Write an enzyme that holds these catalytic residues in place. Structure first.
Site, mmCIF file in Angstrom:
data_model
loop_
_atom_site.group_PDB
_atom_site.id
_atom_site.type_symbol
_atom_site.label_atom_id
_atom_site.label_comp_id
_atom_site.label_asym_id
_atom_site.label_seq_id
_atom_site.Cartn_x
_atom_site.Cartn_y
_atom_site.Cartn_z
ATOM 1 N N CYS B 108 -13.649 -90.599 20.689
ATOM 2 C CA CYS B 108 -14.525 -91.765 20.532
ATOM 3 C C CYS B 108 -15.792 -91.753 21.403
ATOM 4 O O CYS B 108 -15.716 -91.827 22.635
ATOM 5 C CB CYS B 108 -13.748 -93.061 20.775
ATOM 6 S SG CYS B 108 -14.798 -94.538 20.711
ATOM 7 N N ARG B 111 -16.929 -95.264 23.877
ATOM 8 C CA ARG B 111 -16.062 -95.792 24.930
ATOM 9 C C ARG B 111 -16.752 -96.521 26.096
ATOM 10 O O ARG B 111 -16.070 -97.121 26.935
ATOM 11 C CB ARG B 111 -15.097 -94.714 25.428
ATOM 12 C CG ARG B 111 -14.050 -94.310 24.378
ATOM 13 C CD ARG B 111 -13.156 -93.207 24.910
ATOM 14 N NE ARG B 111 -13.729 -91.875 24.737
ATOM 15 C CZ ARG B 111 -13.282 -90.792 25.367
ATOM 16 N NH1 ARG B 111 -12.256 -90.891 26.215
ATOM 17 N NH2 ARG B 111 -13.856 -89.614 25.143
ATOM 18 N N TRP B 280 -18.383 -101.059 15.826
ATOM 19 C CA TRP B 280 -19.528 -100.996 14.938
ATOM 20 C C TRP B 280 -19.847 -99.539 14.680
ATOM 21 O O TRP B 280 -19.313 -98.653 15.357
ATOM 22 C CB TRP B 280 -20.741 -101.769 15.491
ATOM 23 C CG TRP B 280 -21.126 -101.412 16.895
ATOM 24 C CD1 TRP B 280 -21.842 -100.317 17.296
ATOM 25 C CD2 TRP B 280 -20.862 -102.174 18.080
ATOM 26 N NE1 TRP B 280 -22.023 -100.346 18.657
ATOM 27 C CE2 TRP B 280 -21.422 -101.470 19.162
ATOM 28 C CE3 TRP B 280 -20.199 -103.380 18.330
ATOM 29 C CZ2 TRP B 280 -21.341 -101.939 20.481
ATOM 30 C CZ3 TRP B 280 -20.113 -103.838 19.636
ATOM 31 C CH2 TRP B 280 -20.680 -103.119 20.693
ATOM 32 N N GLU B 285 -22.381 -91.675 10.974
ATOM 33 C CA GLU B 285 -21.114 -91.751 10.233
ATOM 34 C C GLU B 285 -21.414 -92.041 8.783
ATOM 35 O O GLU B 285 -20.814 -91.436 7.879
ATOM 36 C CB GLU B 285 -20.207 -92.866 10.775
ATOM 37 C CG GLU B 285 -19.729 -92.660 12.193
ATOM 38 C CD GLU B 285 -18.871 -93.824 12.672
ATOM 39 O OE1 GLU B 285 -17.694 -93.901 12.251
ATOM 40 O OE2 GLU B 285 -19.378 -94.671 13.448
HETATM 41 C C1 HEM Z 1 -17.907 -100.428 19.661
HETATM 42 C C2 HEM Z 1 -18.508 -99.531 18.868
HETATM 43 C C3 HEM Z 1 -17.861 -98.151 18.577
HETATM 44 C C4 HEM Z 1 -18.548 -97.052 18.241
HETATM 45 C C5 HEM Z 1 -20.082 -96.973 18.134
HETATM 46 C C6 HEM Z 1 -17.615 -95.964 18.050
HETATM 47 C C7 HEM Z 1 -17.914 -94.659 17.704
HETATM 48 C C8 HEM Z 1 -16.995 -93.738 17.209
HETATM 49 C C9 HEM Z 1 -17.279 -92.571 16.384
HETATM 50 C C10 HEM Z 1 -18.692 -92.177 15.891
HETATM 51 C C11 HEM Z 1 -16.120 -91.929 16.154
HETATM 52 C C12 HEM Z 1 -15.892 -90.656 15.309
HETATM 53 C C13 HEM Z 1 -15.367 -91.200 13.991
HETATM 54 C C14 HEM Z 1 -15.418 -90.212 12.849
HETATM 55 O O1 HEM Z 1 -16.273 -89.286 12.879
HETATM 56 O O2 HEM Z 1 -14.593 -90.382 11.895
HETATM 57 C C15 HEM Z 1 -15.061 -92.675 16.815
HETATM 58 C C16 HEM Z 1 -13.726 -92.350 16.830
HETATM 59 C C17 HEM Z 1 -12.685 -93.104 17.344
HETATM 60 N N1 HEM Z 1 -12.788 -94.383 17.893
HETATM 61 FE FE1 HEM Z 1 -14.574 -95.302 18.438
HETATM 62 N N2 HEM Z 1 -16.342 -96.465 18.277
HETATM 63 C C18 HEM Z 1 -16.448 -97.815 18.589
HETATM 64 C C19 HEM Z 1 -15.391 -98.677 18.846
HETATM 65 C C20 HEM Z 1 -14.053 -98.355 18.889
HETATM 66 C C21 HEM Z 1 -12.937 -99.272 19.096
HETATM 67 C C22 HEM Z 1 -13.085 -100.801 19.259
HETATM 68 C C23 HEM Z 1 -11.803 -98.552 19.087
HETATM 69 C C24 HEM Z 1 -10.336 -99.013 19.278
HETATM 70 C C25 HEM Z 1 -9.999 -100.185 19.827
HETATM 71 C C26 HEM Z 1 -12.170 -97.159 18.903
HETATM 72 C C27 HEM Z 1 -11.295 -96.099 18.854
HETATM 73 C C28 HEM Z 1 -11.540 -94.865 18.293
HETATM 74 C C29 HEM Z 1 -10.530 -93.857 18.026
HETATM 75 C C30 HEM Z 1 -9.005 -93.919 18.292
HETATM 76 C C31 HEM Z 1 -11.295 -92.686 17.405
HETATM 77 C C32 HEM Z 1 -10.677 -91.362 16.915
HETATM 78 C C33 HEM Z 1 -10.804 -91.402 15.390
HETATM 79 C C34 HEM Z 1 -9.873 -90.433 14.735
HETATM 80 O O3 HEM Z 1 -9.371 -89.517 15.449
HETATM 81 O O4 HEM Z 1 -9.649 -90.582 13.501
HETATM 82 N N3 HEM Z 1 -13.537 -97.083 18.783
HETATM 83 N N4 HEM Z 1 -15.635 -93.760 17.453
HETATM 84 C C1 LIG Z 2 -9.592 -87.385 6.528
HETATM 85 C C2 LIG Z 2 -9.326 -87.702 7.992
HETATM 86 C C3 LIG Z 2 -10.346 -88.281 8.745
HETATM 87 C C4 LIG Z 2 -10.123 -88.584 10.090
HETATM 88 C C5 LIG Z 2 -11.210 -89.224 10.938
HETATM 89 C C6 LIG Z 2 -11.308 -90.715 10.633
HETATM 90 N N1 LIG Z 2 -11.906 -91.398 11.798
HETATM 91 C C7 LIG Z 2 -12.477 -92.670 11.339
HETATM 92 C C8 LIG Z 2 -12.866 -93.610 12.461
HETATM 93 C C9 LIG Z 2 -11.961 -94.031 13.435
HETATM 94 C C10 LIG Z 2 -12.358 -94.915 14.438
HETATM 95 C C11 LIG Z 2 -13.673 -95.377 14.478
HETATM 96 C C12 LIG Z 2 -14.103 -96.266 15.462
HETATM 97 C C13 LIG Z 2 -15.433 -96.690 15.455
HETATM 98 C C14 LIG Z 2 -16.300 -96.215 14.467
HETATM 99 N N2 LIG Z 2 -17.607 -96.594 14.415
HETATM 100 N N3 LIG Z 2 -15.846 -95.355 13.535
HETATM 101 C C15 LIG Z 2 -14.571 -94.938 13.518
HETATM 102 C C16 LIG Z 2 -14.172 -94.073 12.510
HETATM 103 C C17 LIG Z 2 -8.887 -88.306 10.670
HETATM 104 C C18 LIG Z 2 -7.879 -87.730 9.923
HETATM 105 C C19 LIG Z 2 -8.107 -87.433 8.572
HETATM 106 C C20 LIG Z 2 -7.128 -86.893 7.926
HETATM 107 N N4 LIG Z 2 -6.257 -86.487 7.269
#
Ligand code: HEM
Ligand SMILES: Cc1cc(CCNCc2ccc3ccc(N)nc3c2)ccc1C#N
Ligand code: HEM
Ligand SMILES: Cc1cc(CCNCc2ccc3ccc(N)nc3c2)ccc1C#N
Ligand SMILES: C[C@H](O)[C@H](O)[C@H]1CNc2nc(N)[nH]c(=O)c2N1
Ligand SMILES: C[C@H](O)[C@H](O)[C@H]1CNc2nc(N)[nH]c(=O)c2N1
Ligand SMILES: [Zn+2]
Lengths: 416, 404
Positions: B108, B111, B280, B285
């Site tokens: 993420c 953070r 947000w 993305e």
């Molecule tokens: C506040 C604004 C936030 C922004 C700008 C942001 C940004 C991002 C981005 C760009 C990713 C990569 C997602 C992707 O490429 O699919 C990500 C992943 C992630 N975010 Fe954040 N995030 C935010 C808030 C949060 C919040 C509130 C949480 C949880 C309470 C969170 C937890 C996670 C987790 C667990 C991932 C890993 C996604 C995965 O492995 O599928 N994020 N975030």
């Molecule tokens: C197809 C695939 C995709 C992914 C990444 C999704 N991650 C979305 C995500 C999670 C958390 C977010 C928090 C904030 C934000 N702006 N975008 C956020 C977008 C993982 C596993 C598989 C599988 N299988």
């Protein structure tokens, strides 16, 4: 099912298993507890020299493994010539502490080191490597002759050809052959009294070394450095490349006419000279090699890194972009036009170059080739994915497995 | 030892000592690095040790470690596990745990925001209908008329020998993907499978590129139920470009709220199989991945043709040019509609600040470089030049199997 890493492509949905990683005999920097894959030079990636040859037991196993690799590649595994070559290597090490490679083994080894290089996106070309054997070289002057010949052959007036020149291997109680410069072509980096740098800041240290060793410094942004060449147990000697051997390309843009007024340029030949070529436990401390550039190396990294020429803001200003706010994407816009200018100028000049799309597409082909040939391909995702337009290229969507195979090109400490 | 971590732009060096607090294996071994893999390949003393560790983290956080409250809490947890094989969190523990899980998420880039998270306790939920009500409230709160606020809603934890609460959708807002028998897909190809699941549970489909899906909500050991979201709950942003007037004609749009709903929240050994969260969007993305991925909407060539670019050859960088304009349009449209969004330069700059905050606070920060570096203009952002260490800390957000 299969007891090997499963590797997925998320664009295409397709799955492979890497069985090749089983052949790795050397640990990388990662553990179950933490991944260190993003480190440029972890302790597990650098070598260290010792004045005496390796434990003969250690050499022999590395040697037998390589000889086996060789005899496989020529489909004579188990043959009488295969077993006799083994005996010959055991005997040679038994009496001298080291051994020597036949010419065809050196050729196979150099190609395999390139083929095995996880950070190289150009490996589709791995079988087309011209191997110059320079293991007869006995002086710094002669290294210069060999290097000039390499440059002439590899440059080929812009129709670039991949080549490596191999100087004599590390020897028990004798100093290394070393090229002090990181590349055969490098622009000077002059530290100004204000603390800033004129030229390429990547090259500050080597520039000052050249000066300490008697080079009279220029004061341009694109001064070609002389070579610091080191024959065994001797101080390095200084050699100026004849300017007509160093092909350069002035940068201009296809539609932005002011770009040419920037006075930017880059050299044609990427010729890396500070890496150690390791084959069957033998260590070639001087073995410079060259291919051709991928355009992002010049246009994105060398020209736009904050710690390199750092020209992004200058170009953005000429493009009249809003540089006061990140959200105008002024950086992305300028970076694209700078890469375009690199591509356009190299094509205009008839100098081989490959864009990051063509390059990564061809690397995907390489992956499929190797899947069939060896059951995998070691690859460092962070290095293979280009520094702009990452997810626009197919490699971004390709999971990769990273591991160390030998023959290998390895980092080695600077001679000083 | 402990990893030396270097920034190549600044020459600065740190040492990560936080990684020593990891009790969970990642996919790498000394023989081969598997860092680029998207997914992982695959009694009561264990639960008790995870529970104690978490309670310790919690009381350390409010700086009351060794207190009477701390010792009594450890005994409560131990008494409850010994008798029932499980235990329960207090709300304040859950709020702390949810924030820590986000804080520990290596993938993420957002953070810097981790301490600002609204936690809704939905553990007193007994039905899919109640899950829907909680979700609508989450969406209303988090959307806040475009002034987005980060939130998480936590549904009841997994219990042995009983099915889980699950939201089948991967996000609360997803556009349908309809598989056209002529090979192709209309809408979002990432959502073909969920779209088909909805239809066969009785959803009446649309035929558009941007049809918002109903939620499939599942209470333990019951078939999932279908719930259509009220359209006034789903804020969407029509995409246009600040100078290319034809761009609006493409009919492109995206939704405001990235609310992820298929991840498992693990706190102190307890597992929350439904705990949707939202923040947000970072513009890439939408502008790069969702709109330009070849296996998503794949609009690069359409835009390139409109921009009258030479599509015939890679070296014109038509793809790069079109992508940049698409990302610009997303930023512009979101800013015009007053909906929170952050560009990838601002986001990575905040993450660098976050890394420095964490170094001082915890002696490190788990980060996945390949996920932190944005999908366009990578080395143009400061994170590209920053070495990172990846490892698993708990509390954590984890992947879990699809419930079908
Ligand atoms: C506040 C604004 C936030 C922004 C700008 C942001 C940004 C991002 C981005 C760009 C990713 C990569 C997602 C992707 O490429 O699919 C990500 C992943 C992630 N975010 Fe954040 N995030 C935010 C808030 C949060 C919040 C509130 C949480 C949880 C309470 C969170 C937890 C996670 C987790 C667990 C991932 C890993 C996604 C995965 O492995 O599928 N994020 N975030
Ligand atoms: C197809 C695939 C995709 C992914 C990444 C999704 N991650 C979305 C995500 C999670 C958390 C977010 C928090 C904030 C934000 N702006 N975008 C956020 C977008 C993982 C596993 C598989 C599988 N299988
Ligand atoms: C023929 C065209 C070639 C292309 C387009 C190409 C492309 C590249 C690129 C873009 C990199 C990343 C370099 C960086 O970011 O600093 C790289 C790395 C590398 N290349 Fe290739 N290459 C080519 C030929 C060769 C040849 C002939 C060799 C050796 C015989 C080679 C061996 C390597 C090695 C060992 C690395 C790792 C560099 C490092 O770790 O510092 N390449 N290549
Ligand atoms: C400062 C530094 C830089 C690097 C990457 C250099 N890689 C250049 C290189 C090597 C081989 C190449 C082959 C072909 C090509 N086109 N470019 C090629 C570029 C690694 C470690 C350190 C350190 N310390
Ligand atoms: C910190 C990070 O490892 C470093 O900036 C790497 C990332 N990927 C790279 N990829 C290539 N091809 N070349 C590089 O120098 C780097 N640098
Ligand atoms: C194979 C590779 O790991 C995969 O495509 C990753 C790369 N980095 C990513 N980074 C982000 N932020 N999101 C992603 O989905 C991915 N995908
Ligand atoms: Zn790893």
């Amino acid at each position: 099912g299969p007891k090997f890493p499963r590797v997925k492509n998320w664009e295409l949905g397709s799955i492979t298993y890497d069985t090749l990683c089983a052949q790795s005999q050397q640990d990388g920097p990662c553990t179950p507890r933490r991944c260190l894959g993003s480190l440029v030079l972890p302790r597990k990636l650098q070598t260290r020299p010792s004045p005496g040859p390796p434990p003969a037991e250690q050499l022999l196993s590395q040697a037998r493994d390589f000889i086996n690799q060789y005899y496989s590649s020529i489909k004579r595994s188990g043959s009488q010539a295969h077993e006799e070559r083994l005996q010959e290597v055991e005997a040679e090490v038994a009496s001298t502490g080291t051994y020597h490679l036949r010419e065809s083994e050196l050729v196979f080894g150099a190609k395999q080191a390139w083929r095995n290089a996880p950070r190289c996106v150009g490996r589709i070309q791995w079988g087309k490597l011209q191997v110059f054997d320079a293991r007869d070289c006995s002086s710094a002057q002669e290294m210069f002759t060999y290097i000039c010949n390499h440059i002439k052959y590899a440059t080929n007036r812009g129709n670039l050809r991949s080549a490596i020149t191999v100087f004599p291997q590390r020897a028990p109680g004798r100093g290394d052959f070393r090229i002090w410069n990181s590349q055969l072509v490098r622009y000077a980096g002059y530290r100004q009294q204000d603390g800033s740098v004129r030229g390429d800041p990547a090259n500050v240290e080597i520039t000052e070394l050249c000066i300490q060793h008697g080079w009279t410094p220029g004061n341009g942004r694109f001064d070609v450095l002389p070579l610091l060449l080191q024959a065994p147990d001797e101080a390095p000697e200084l050699f100026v490349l004849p300017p007509e051997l160093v092909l350069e390309v002035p940068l201009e843009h296809p539609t932005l006419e002011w770009f040419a007024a920037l006075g930017l340029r880059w050299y044609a030949l990427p010729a890396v000279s500070n890496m150690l070529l390791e084959i069957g436990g033998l260590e070639f401390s001087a073995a410079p090699f060259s291919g051709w550039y991928m355009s992002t190396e010049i246009g994105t990294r060398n020209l736009c890194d904050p710690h390199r020429y750092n020209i992004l803001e200058d170009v953005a200003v000429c493009m009249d972009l809003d540089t006061r706010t990140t959200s105008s994407l002024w950086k992305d816009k300028a970076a694209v036009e700078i890469n375009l200018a690199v591509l356009h100028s190299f094509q205009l000049a008839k100098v081989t170059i490959v864009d990051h799309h063509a390059a990564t597409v061809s690397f995907m082909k390489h992956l499929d080739n190797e899947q069939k040939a060896r059951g995998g391909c070691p690859a460092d995702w962070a290095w293979i994915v280009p520094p702009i337009s990452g997810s626009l290229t197919p490699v971004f969507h390709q999971e990769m497995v990273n591991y160390i195979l030998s023959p290998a090109f390895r980092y080695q400490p600077d001679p000083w």
